[PDB]
Amino acid sequence: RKLGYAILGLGYYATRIIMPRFAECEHSRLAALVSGTPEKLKTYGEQYGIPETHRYSYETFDRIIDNPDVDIVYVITPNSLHRPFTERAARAGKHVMCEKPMANTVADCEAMIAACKKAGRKLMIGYRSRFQAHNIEAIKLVRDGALGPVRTVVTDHGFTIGDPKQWRLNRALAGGGSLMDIGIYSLNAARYLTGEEPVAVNAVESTDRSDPRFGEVEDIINFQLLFPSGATANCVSAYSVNCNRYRVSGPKGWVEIDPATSYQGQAMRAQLGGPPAPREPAPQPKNQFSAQLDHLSECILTGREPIVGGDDGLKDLRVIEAIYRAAREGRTVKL
């Protein structure tokens, strides 16, 4: 049994990364395209053999309720449009896969969760690293007690951004700067490595507002998290350095991945009561993208809830609001 996906927003991630990976899926297929660019519907429709009946503009999208080949809409647009497209997908009786960050605010996430709940449809956020081999290995080592209690998580995510005119540098479409786009990987990782939610937050922003890229959103905002167990995290979020990594440590040892949450190339090193050494994770059947896609499909088919549901995206937005507040007010924000 395969469930049908409509991909909405035919941009870089949708067309270069997600859509090719349906080939390795076991319970998911590409069934429809939704796009504000007529030329894209033709090109990708013809390339993937999607009939004109299964091609939608943003103005014909609501008619997708009548298409039984579509079970899931995967929203892959600029951040500020996640909420409205998610609401309309739910209104058309479809389950929803929504990219990160879930939405611009906590209230927006709550609205999305409520809309899907009212429609009796499932909602999943695209945290693919939860389906990536090295990340799974790290999470399980922590849970199995290989490190003892988690004491520190040190995680850095950033890339040197370019073109000042792109939507990520537009506050109205992005919702915020590096933290919304890439720093959220540091946050999401601190949360799934500890298996906890933070109770206190520090942050510091560093942005040159005279830079053509950063008139509206932040460049660097680094943050500290304290968790109930006493676990701590130091996190980097940046648009002016390239980094992608974490190390989680306890009294019995540590494990790190660098790059940690990239499309490919993950490399893990561990120190588990002996000398530091490379560590291969347990093999996974399918790549992280195909796994993410099937996870939602399998959840629908078996009546389970996704391991990264709308509530996971909401929990990230909760801390992100606190991070922004801490950097703005120059104080520890309690949660």
Amino acid identity of residue 117, one-letter, is: K
For the chain, give the number of residues.
335
Out of 20, 38, 145, 230, point to the residue binding a second copy (CB under 8 A): 230
Nearest to 104 by CA among 81, 123, 87: 81
User: Residue count at the site for ligand NAP (CB under 6 A)?
Assistant: 22
Active-site residue, selected from the candidate residues 94, 100, 122, 315: 100
User: Dihedral through CA 312, CA 156, CA 141, CA 233, nearest 10?
Assistant: -70
The rounded distance, in Å, linking the Cα atoms of 107 and 231 is 28
Is 185 catalytic? The answer is yes
The rounded distance, in Å, linking the Cα atoms of 141 and 227 is 19
State the minimum distance, in angstroms, from the CB of residue 220 to a second copy: 6
Contacting range for ligand NAP; rule: CB under 6 A; set: 8-16, 60-68, 215-223, 318-326? 8-16
Choose from a second copy, ligand NAP, none: what does 271 bind? Cβ within 5-8 Å by kind: a second copy
Instruction: Give yes or no for residue 57 binding a second copy (CB under 8 A).
Output: no
Both tokens of 199, joined, read 């109770």
Instruction: Give yes or no for residue 203 binding a second copy (CB under 8 A).
Output: yes
Amino acid identity of residue 329, one-letter, is: E
Treating both helix axes as pointing N-terminal to C-terminal, what angle do 133-143 and 184-194 enclose, rounded to 10 degrees?
40
Choose from ligand NAP, a second copy, none: what does 242 bind? Cβ within 5-8 Å by kind: a second copy
Out of 2, 11, 24, 111, point to the residue binding ligand NAP (CB under 6 A): 11
Out of 146, 173, 241, 267, point to the residue binding ligand NAP (CB under 6 A): 173
Instruction: Give yes or no for residue 9 binding ligand NAP (CB under 6 A).
Output: yes
Instruction: Give yes or no for residue 13 binding ligand NAP (CB under 6 A).
Output: yes
State the minimum distance, in angstroms, from the CB of residue 175 to ligand NAP: 9
With a CB cutoff of 8 Å and minimum separation 6, the contacts of 130 are: 136, 192, 292, 307, 308
Both tokens of 4, joined, read 């049908």
Nearest to 221 by CA among 208, 234, 236: 236
The catalytic site residues sit at 100, 185
Binding residues (CB under 8 A) for a second copy: these are 151-152, 154, 156, 158, 160, 200, 202-204, 206-208, 220, 222, 224, 226, 230-232, 234-236, 238, 240-243, 247, 249-251, 253-254, 271, 330-332
